[PDB]
Amino acid sequence: KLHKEPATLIKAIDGDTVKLMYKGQPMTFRLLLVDTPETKHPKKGVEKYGPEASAFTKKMVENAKKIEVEFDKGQRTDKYGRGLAYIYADGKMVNEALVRQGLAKVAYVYKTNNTHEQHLRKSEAQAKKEKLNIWS
């Protein structure tokens, strides 16, 4: 069973990457199961909805009273040293919030870390059906 642990915001980087203080050390976290449009890499450049996704996440984590991280059951870091988790702002999952708004797509689904896969896929279908942002 998964469990939530407290963390403290340091800085929001983009739609799906945030820096937090976790168990007293600064770490970069990458949200599990989603992909927000790129705003940094020279390849593909600044994708559409990139800025918007960034703005969404920033606002959500910066306005929260409490931030929590919840690791899945498999690896806890990616090849770049980033923590892989579901992040909550006042008990609301940022990962899901993004999908529900059409600011991210369900992606990077690894069999070892996919506990909330179905939950996110349901939210994505709803955003598609409402033709929001990315799906417009």
Ligand X SMILES: Cc1cn([C@H]2C[C@H](OP(=O)(O)O)[C@@H](COP(=O)(O)O)O2)c(=O)[nH]c1=O
Tell me whether residue 16 is annotated as binding. Answer: yes
69 φ/ψ sector (left φ>0, alpha ψ -120 to 50, else beta)? beta
Return the closest-CA partner of residue 81 out of 12, 26, 3: 26
84 binds, among Ca ion, ligand X, none (CB under 5 to 8 A by kind): ligand X
- Minimum CB distance to ligand X smaller for 30 or for 100: 30
44 binds, among Ca ion, ligand X, none (CB under 5 to 8 A by kind): none
Tell me whether residue 14 is annotated as binding. Answer: no
- Minimum CB distance to Ca ion smaller for 35 or for 70: 35
Contact flag: residue 112 with ligand X (CB under 6 A): no
Contacts of 9 (CB under 8 A, 6+ apart): 18, 19, 20, 21, 61, 62, 64, 67
123 binds, among ligand X, Ca ion, none (CB under 5 to 8 A by kind): none
Minimum distance from residue 54 beta carbon to Ca ion (Å):
10
β-bridge partners, 31: 85
Catalytic residues, by residue number, are 30, 38, 82
Name residue, tokens 């770490």. Answer: 27
Q: Which residues are annotated as a binding site for Ca(2+)?
A: 16, 35-36
